[PDB]
Amino acid sequence: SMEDYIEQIYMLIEEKGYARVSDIAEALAVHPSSVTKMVQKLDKDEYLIYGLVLTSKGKKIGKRLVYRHELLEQFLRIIGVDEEKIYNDVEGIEHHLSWNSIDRIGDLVQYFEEDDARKKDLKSIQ
Amino acid sequence: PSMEDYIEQIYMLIEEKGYARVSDIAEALAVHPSSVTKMVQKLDKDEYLIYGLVLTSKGKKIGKRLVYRHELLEQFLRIIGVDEEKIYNDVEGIEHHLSWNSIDRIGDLVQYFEEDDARKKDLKSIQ
Ligand SMILES: [Fe+2]
Ligand SMILES: [Fe+2]
Ligand SMILES: [Fe+2]
Ligand SMILES: [Fe+2]
């Protein structure tokens, strides 16, 4: 859950300029008290300080996590997964992949983006 | 482990040995036998198997789908160039969090690279 929270805190600060406990609580579908506990843990491990401000360490990771999520949505979208199924598929796999897999998926995405004909040929197989 | 993890290993053990011992399941999933015996009672409740352990047609159906899923996903990461050493753990982590939709489209993607090595080569060039 540590990564889920930092992904969330990062996204809110980028969206609003700050990360309210109630906003984290709502985005994650948890009770505020749960948020508290985790925040004190992220503060202990130096991902943030107290409102909430990400340290450089928490920023790098937040940026990575938003990048992994977007890349995985894009990958499932390119290979033709139903848009409605993409978000839940990504959430489920995103934190369980090695960086090696992520980067190779990164290269595959680039593969298809670099020449629409490849997208067309894949669509043909389908 | 999840229900699917268990069906997956039980199906494999039967395919390997002809039978599925509780001890072999525990060792395969690195769990205590108790975690196994209680999951087995649940699998039996849901009519995936019976008591040794025999899969019902419903259990064989699922087990077979799961072994297919595992193989396909390893093949996928293999093809796009993930270090072989990393592949097993990645597949174990995602296999049971992907919709059938995503599985099938990954299937299609594997078929895509399979039918023209030139595509494989072009993928390598980008890397
Ligand atoms: Fe997650
Ligand atoms: Fe995500
Ligand atoms: Fe699993
Ligand atoms: Fe598996």
UniProtKB/Swiss-Prot annotation, chain A:
**One Pfam family, short name:** Fe_dep_repress
Q: Which residues form the HTH dtxR-type domain?
A: 1-55
* Major subcellular site: cytoplasm
The entry summarizes the disruption phenotype as follows:
Null mutant is very sensitive to manganese. Mutant also displays increased sensitivity to cadmium.
Q: Name one GO cellular component term.
A: cytoplasm
Q: How is its activity regulated?
A: DNA binding is strongly activated by Mn(2+) and Cd(2+), but it is poorly activated by non-cognate metal cations, including Co(2+), Fe(2+), Ni(2+), Ca(2+) and Zn(2+). In the strict absence of divalent transition metal ions, MntR has a low affinity for DNA.
**PROSITE patterns recorded:** HTH_DTXR (PS50944)
Location relative to the cell: Cytoplasm
* GO BP terms: intracellular manganese ion homeostasis
Annotated positions binding Cd(2+) 1: D4, E91, E94, H95
Impact after mutating D4M: Binds only one manganese ion, in a pseudo-hexacoordinate geometry
Q: Which superkingdom, per the lineage?
A: Bacteria
How does this protein assemble?
Homodimer.
Q: What is known of its domains?
A: Contains an N-terminal DNA-binding domain and a C-terminal dimerization domain. Contains two metal binding sites per subunit, site A (corresponding to metal ion 2) and site C (corresponding to metal ion 1), which both contribute to the metal selectivity of MntR. A large metal cation is needed at the A site to correctly orient and position the C site ligands. Smaller, non-cognate metal cations bind at the A site, but disrupt the C site, blocking the full activation of MntR. Binding at the C site also favors Mn(2+) and Cd(2+) over other metals.
The entry's function note states: Central regulator of manganese homeostasis that regulates the expression of both manganese uptake and efflux systems. In the presence of high levels of manganese, it mediates repression of the manganese uptake systems MntH and MntABCD and activation of the efflux systems MneP and MneS. Binds with high affinity to the regulatory regions of its target genes. The manganese concentration required for activation of efflux is higher than that for repression of uptake.
Family designation: Belongs to the DtxR/MntR family.
Per its record, how is this protein called by name? HTH-type transcriptional regulator MntR
The gene designation is mntR
